[PDB]
Design a protein around this ligand. Structure first.
Ligand SMILES: Cc1cc2nc3c(=O)[nH]c(=O)nc-3n(C[C@H](O)[C@H](O)[C@H](O)COP(=O)(O)O)c2cc1C
Ligand code: SF4
Ligand code: SF4
Ligand code: SF4
Ligand code: FES
Ligand code: FES
Ligand SMILES: [K+]
Lengths: 45, 432, 214, 263
């Protein structure tokens, strides 16, 4: 806990992998909110 | 009444206190440093209060243009028409020489997350889309971890910070285009189209992402918003000259002894910034040739101007250049200035979207000429032709990339014309 | 060699096999759910990058599948792939070496980095090694201008390089180890090399500077 | 009623809100130069040839896309407006191929005509030119795409009129190429109409290739009988022979399109 300014604490990214970013977005899905709807399945509908 | 000297910002007055990554970037550490503090009270005070404090701060966008932020963010403050409203955070960080936003995202992510909410509450937004360049994969992952932490702790999501306001923060990654930093092009990339800018009108606050009111903001502009609201705008205005108020992250690169990223008070003298933090120029100030103050898209300035120029929006304009992203590139007398500037034109050639004519063809045309200027295979009368070609690309383009490829060429012709002519004549003698 | 037209080959044709894996379909469903209903086309870029991560490059079949699942015209997917430079429409090596040659990195002798890699790997810029491990290309500013010279290999930045170091990074990659991202000089990030000139004092705790009411 | 008042070179014209600078200049008889704007297609604002000066404003605005605002005075013949046109035309012609003698669009080309009226008389481009591959999109349309000026009229027509989204842009910058990326045929009952909208010789009629020149053809206004729509047409005849069929505009029938069978 004593103030140490001599270490690089952002060392987690040395372990990240190819699918990391999308896996975390999958885990974040439950926390979202109902998206808004235009009223049509697509502009081509 | 007046501060006639600027610089020497005390660490307690600095905003990005983990800029160098020497503390924890997760929620626990950031909460110690003051983030996510009384954020419930900020949100309940109201959109008008948040905008009013941002207006008083004199804050201007750190993305390049430097438009007054509070006025810009107040376009969105209007009754809903039925469409949603979004905040878009520009983390594309594409301007050569500029690396400020990479640190904020990876070492102080929760400042950005909190700014989205405070900025979003002011605009009335229902969510934030943080557009981060695709090469910032590790930085993007760090932000998602932070966003997950805030989602789990109630800081963002349904009834965020106990304020009754529902706000979601998404992260979308680009796929490799400097032009996607442009606010309208960024919107179109999110929508799933080629990163080609739009024409204005319509302005993004009326028709934006998904055809809904939207506001595009820089990472640094958003990250400082929570701090402005707690500590107060007058604090942020206490620093800097009038109308150039605030503190600015600077990136000093090029021929310097200690290239670095650093936060300093706006309107700081340029010579002080380089000599103090970056270790001065390689070989000393007398070996300095020219400086690019605000990244590639800013005219260079020669040593004669670098001595006494303050690094704020207004002063650099009176020098016929711009603060831009406040990214300082330093070239020494050993540099081949023409080759350096030509490579920037070659960069704008590879990053133009091709949508509109003056930049689709003009930037190619400038690239080809500047390549000949390097070898000297040109006549002295082509220099003035290049100037007119540049002025035909400026003001006649959809975005500002063309404006940003003309100003660099205009700077070289303005301050280093004798160097161009000297190289031309030498090539003539050799071809005898 | 910078071609933006497709000519069918035995390896790349609309019938070349490719479909997402069962795990990646769940990832897609998350991607598509991040955008408003009626604008699934917004998922084209993230889903396209997903295909390249699974397969290593984007064959013509891969683009068509992305369009089919998102109900997007196939051409509109072809446009996106060509516009953006991170999408590989030709096979690339297991490790994709990218060198920034823009002015800030050019002023700090990024050319020396480019020359060292060329000597060690025995390839010229744009070519692939015979073993298909490495592919070399020049790129523009990668966002690490202060830490120049720098290169990106796959999704990791290796910074503050020197001709010796980049050979070491290649040597580790050849053996099987994956080197450690970050500046290879005596520093950690963007901080002033010799020593910190700011943020040396302890950070101020919560509630510091708060205004009267807030 | 809801009409607002604007000035075109000082002469007052009353225009409905939402009207563009361009459309306002029409009501006084002035045609702004154009390459990308088409009244029956979506606005694009990419050629930049419509640029026009607004008095007491420092930036030229794209007339095809900018709505008029009350009180604006539109300077169509100002020096700033005329110099903007010359610059744009100079960029358009920089990489354009020297193909007018071998190009069927000669004599009816908007690039030729608008260069003569709104452009300079000489070039200062001392560099090499771009060259592009040719793309086969069927037996009815010939593609010499080195002549393309990237106006995206074909892309918009196919999407917004024909309903076919097979034409697009691949690449970016000077290397951006209109096409299908893949080897595909733009076959449709309205395919031929991309030939007309294309203001240059990039898209031309294969059947009509090389047979005639615009000035030597007599124009006869007749009707189409291949169907019951009664599309109005023009029959181009030279020396007692029929050379081509062109659409003739009728708003209440065929607008300015005809079917491939008619053509
Ligand atoms: C070619 C081009 C690239 C740009 N890149 C960025 C960028 O990377 N980051 C950024 O914040 N703004 C960038 N901008 C500026 C944006 O268009 C826009 O003005 C800005 O993001 C608004 O944010 P602000 O109000 O906080 O300054 C770019 C503009 C252009 C023309
Ligand atoms: S100026 Fe260049 S980058 Fe901007 S819209 Fe025109 S072609 Fe695209
Ligand atoms: S399109 Fe027009 S300018 Fe171009 S070669 Fe054909 S006739 Fe000449
Ligand atoms: S082919 Fe013709 S219509 Fe299509 S973009 Fe080129 S010039 Fe315009
Ligand atoms: S100039 Fe190379 S990373 Fe920016
Ligand atoms: S007619 Fe307006 S930009 Fe083309
Ligand atoms: K044509």
């Amino acid at each position: 806990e004593p103030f140490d300014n001599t270490t690089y604490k952002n060392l987690q990214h040395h372990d990240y992998s190819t699918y990391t970013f999308l896996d975390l977005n999958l885990d974040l899905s439950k926390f979202r909110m109902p998206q808004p709807s235009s009223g049509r399945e697509s502009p081509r509908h | 009444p007046k501060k006639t000297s600027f610089g020497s910002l005390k660490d307690e007055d600095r905003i990005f206190t983990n800029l160098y990554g020497r503390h924890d970037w997760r929620l626990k550490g950031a909460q110690s440093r003051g983030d996510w503090y009384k954020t419930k009270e900020i949100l309940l005070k109201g959109p008008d209060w948040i905008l009013g404090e941002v207006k008083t701060s004199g804050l201007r966008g750190r993305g390049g243009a430097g438009f007054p932020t509070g006025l810009k963010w107040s376009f969105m403050n209007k009754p809903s028409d039925g469409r949603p409203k979004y905040l878009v955070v520009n983390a594309d960080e594409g301007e050569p020489g500029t690396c400020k936003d990479r640190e904020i995202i990876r070492h102080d992510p929760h400042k950005l997350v909190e700014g989205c909410l405070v900025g979003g509450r002011a605009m009335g937004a229902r969510a934030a889309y943080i557009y981060i360049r695709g090469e910032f994969y590790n930085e993007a992952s760090n932000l998602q971890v932070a966003i997950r932490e805030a989602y789990e702790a109630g800081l963002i999501g349904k009834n965020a910070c106990g304020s009754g306001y529902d706000f979601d923060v998404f992260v979308v990654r680009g796929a490799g285009a400097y032009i996607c930093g442009e606010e309208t092009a960024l919107i179109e990339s999110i929508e799933g189209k080629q990163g080609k800018p739009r024409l204005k009108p319509p302005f993004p606050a009326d028709v934006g992402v998904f055809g809904c009111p939207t506001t595009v903001a820089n990472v640094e502009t958003v990250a400082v918003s929570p701090t402005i609201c707690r500590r107060g705008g007058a604090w942020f205005a206490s620093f800097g000259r009038e109308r150039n108020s605030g503190t600015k992250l600077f990136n000093i690169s090029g021929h310097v002894n200690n290239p670095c990223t650093v936060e300093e008070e706006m309107s700081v003298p340029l010579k002080e910034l380089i000599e103090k933090h970056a270790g001065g120029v390689t070989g000393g100030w007398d070996n300095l040739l020219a400086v690019i103050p605000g990244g590639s898209s800013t005219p260079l300035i020669p040593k004669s101007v670098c001595e006494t120029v303050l690094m704020d929006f207004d002063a650099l304009i009176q020098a016929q250049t711009g603060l831009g992203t406040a990214a300082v590139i330093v070239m020494d007398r050993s540099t081949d200035i023409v080759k350096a500037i030509a490579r920037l034109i070659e960069f704008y050639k590879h990053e133009s979207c091709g949508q509109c004519t003056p930049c689709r063809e003009g930037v190619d045309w400038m690239n080809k000429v500047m390549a000949r200027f390097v070898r000297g295979d040109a006549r002295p009368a082509e220099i003035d032709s290049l100037w007119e070609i540049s002025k035909q690309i400026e003001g006649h383009t959809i975005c500002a990339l063309g404006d940003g490829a003309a100003w660099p060429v205009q700077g070289l012709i303005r301050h280093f014309r004798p160097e161009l002519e000297e190289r031309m004549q030498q090539f003539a003698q050799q071809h005898q | 060699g910078a071609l933006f037209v497709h000519r069918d080959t035995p390896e790349n044709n609309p019938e070349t096999p490719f479909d997402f894996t069962p795990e990646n379909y769940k990832r897609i469903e998350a991607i598509v759910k991040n955008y408003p209903e009626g604008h699934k086309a917004a998922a084209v870029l993230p889903v396209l990058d997903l295909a390249q991560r699974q397969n290593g490059w984007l064959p013509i079949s891969a683009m068509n599948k992305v369009a089919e699942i998102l109900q997007v015209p196939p051409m509109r997917v072809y446009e996106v792939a060509t516009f953006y430079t991170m999408y590989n429409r030709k096979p690339v090596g297991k490790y994709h070496i990218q060198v920034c040659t823009t002015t800030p990195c050019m002023l700090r002798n990024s050319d020396s980095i480019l020359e060292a890699i060329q000597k060690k790997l025995g390839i010229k810029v744009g070519e692939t090694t015979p073993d298909k491990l490495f592919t070399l290309i020049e790129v523009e500013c990668l966002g690490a201008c202060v830490n120049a010279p720098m290169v990106q290999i796959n999704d990791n930045y290796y910074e503050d390089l020197t001709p010796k170091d980049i050979e070491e990074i290649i040597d580790e990659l050849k053996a099987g180890k994956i080197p450690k991202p970050g500046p290879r000089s005596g520093r950690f990030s963007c901080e002033p090399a010799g020593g910190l000139t700011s943020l040396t004092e302890p950070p101020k705790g919560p509630g510091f500077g708060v205004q009267a009411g807030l | 009623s809801n009409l607002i008042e604007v000035f075109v070179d000082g002469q007052s014209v009353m225009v409905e809100p939402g009207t563009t600078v361009l459309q306002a200049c029409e009501k006084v008889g002035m045609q702004i130069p154009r390459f990308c704007y088409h009244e029956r297609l979506s606005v694009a604002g990419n050629c930049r040839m419509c640029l026009v000066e607004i008095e007491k404003a420092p930036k030229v605005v794209a007339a095809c896309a900018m709505p008029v605002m009350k009180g604006w005075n539109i300077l169509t013949n100002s020096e700033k407006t005329k110099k903007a046109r010359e610059g744009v035309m100079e960029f358009l012609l920089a990489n354009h191929p020297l193909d007018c003698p071998i190009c069927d669009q000669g004599g009816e080309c908007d690039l030729q005509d608008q260069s003569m009226m709104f452009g300079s008389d000489r070039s200062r481009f001392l560099e090499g030119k771009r060259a592009v591959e040719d793309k086969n999109i069927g037996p009815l349309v010939k593609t010499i795409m080195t002549r393309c000026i990237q106006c995206t009229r074909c892309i918009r027509f196919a999407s917004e009129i024909a309903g076919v989204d097979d034409l697009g842009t691949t690449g970016r910058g000077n290397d951006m190429q209109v096409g299908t990326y893949i080897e595909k045929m733009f076959m449709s009952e309205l395919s031929g109409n991309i030939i007309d909208i294309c203001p240059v010789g990039a898209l031309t009629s294969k059947p009509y290739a090389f047979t005639a020149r615009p000035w030597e053809t007599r124009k006869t206004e007749s009707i189409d009988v291949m169907d019951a729509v009664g599309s109005n047409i023009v029959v181009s005849t030279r020396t007692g022979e029929v050379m081509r069929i062109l659409p003739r505009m009728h708003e209440d029938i065929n607008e300015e399109w005809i079917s491939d069978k008619t053509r």
